[PDB]
Design a protein around this ligand. Structure first.
Ligand code: 8MH
Ligand code: CL
Length: 294
């Protein structure tokens, strides 16, 4: 599994800040927009993109405050990410897109899709944010930890002072061992402790046991939209998963219209790190089927 990141940096001004993105593949056709989550960057897509770039433009931004994007003194609420990603998409002049989305990137993508349904041609998603009705529906092995993340004093000590989301949670979200080179690529945006704000605000935004109520409502709304939409859907899942257990993947594969589900084998949260070639290959092939009328 490749450890390099052989993509030239592209930058665009967005709301007075600068955002970094990968941009490879042909200039024409429908672009494929790849959205990462917490605590990753476009690096998480590095072994997926080469499967898609022969046929499609691939655009993979770093969320504001993450990767090579700027780090303004924000709270990095989900609202902030929404504002910056909306502006990012307009700054590149994107019209119609296919979305490839993960974790908080899926919350961004689905919320954008709900508001711009005529511009989304397809959605490939994995380990995505859905409402978690009670803590029992959060995986046991991760319960204590995320409950601690969702406090001000203890959670900030863990995530900001001790960098636990990078040094601990991240490798615990991959079944295979991450190498030192991979770990250094994930560490790079957060070497300065004060820059770790997004890593702490994100788990505090997760829609768990009804809180925070604003995020729960927004996530329910885009899941309702997703259930009503005929847009082509491709769902990757692994065993045991984290956000999406196999039973829920099986349920969604039937409840969501026009949904193809693909089992990647053993996987936790960063499915891209455990089976990039299957995920990349299946996305490339599915993209081709979007042009077959049937
Ligand atoms: C968008 C969703 C992304 C999800 C990707 C999920 O990955 C699965 C996440 O499970 C694994 C999460 N992290 C670790 O184990 C790191 C190691 N670690 C520590 O050092 C520590 C040190 C001091 C106190 C504590 C503590 N407080 N009371 N025990 C509770 C937990 C830990 C801890 C603790 O855990
Ligand atoms: Cl999170």
């Amino acid at each position: 599994i490749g450890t390099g990141f052989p993509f030239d940096p592209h930058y665009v001004e967005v709301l007075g800040e600068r955002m970094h993105y990968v941009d490879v593949g042909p200039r024409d056709g429908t672009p494929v927009l790849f959205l990462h989550g917490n605590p990753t960057s476009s690096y998480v897509w590095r072994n997926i993109i080469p499967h898609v770039a022969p046929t499609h433009r691939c655009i993979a931004p770093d969320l504001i405050g993450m990767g090579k994007s700027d780090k303004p003194d924000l709270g990095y609420f989900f609202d902030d990410h929404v504002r910056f990603m909306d502006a990012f998409i307009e700054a590149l002049g994107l019209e119609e897109v296919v979305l490839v989305i993960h974790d908080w990137g899926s919350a961004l993508g689905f919320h954008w899709a709900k508001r711009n349904p005529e511009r989304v041609k397809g959605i490939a998603f994995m380990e995505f944010i859905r409402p978690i009705p009670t803590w029992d529906e959060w995986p046991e092995f991760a319960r204590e930890t995320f409950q601690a993340f969702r406090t001000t004093d203890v959670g900030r000590k863990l995530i900001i002072d001790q960098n636990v989301f990078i040094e601990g949670t991240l490798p615990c979200g991959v079944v295979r061992p991450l190498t030192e080179v991979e770990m250094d690529h994930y560490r790079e945006p957060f070497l300065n402790p004060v820059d770790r704000e997004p890593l702490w605000r994100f788990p505090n935004e997760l829609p768990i046991a009804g809180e925070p109520a604003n995020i729960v409502a927004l996530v329910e709304e885009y899941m309702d939209w997703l259930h009503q939409s005929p847009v082509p859907k491709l769902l990757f899942w692994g065993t045991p998963g984290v956000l999406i257990p196999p039973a829920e993947a099986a349920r969604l594969a039937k409840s969501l219209p026009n949904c193809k589900a693909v089992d990647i084998g053993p996987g936790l949260n960063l499915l891209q790190e455990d089976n990039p070639d299957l995920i990349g290959s299946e996305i490339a092939r599915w993209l081709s089927t979007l042009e077959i009328s049937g």
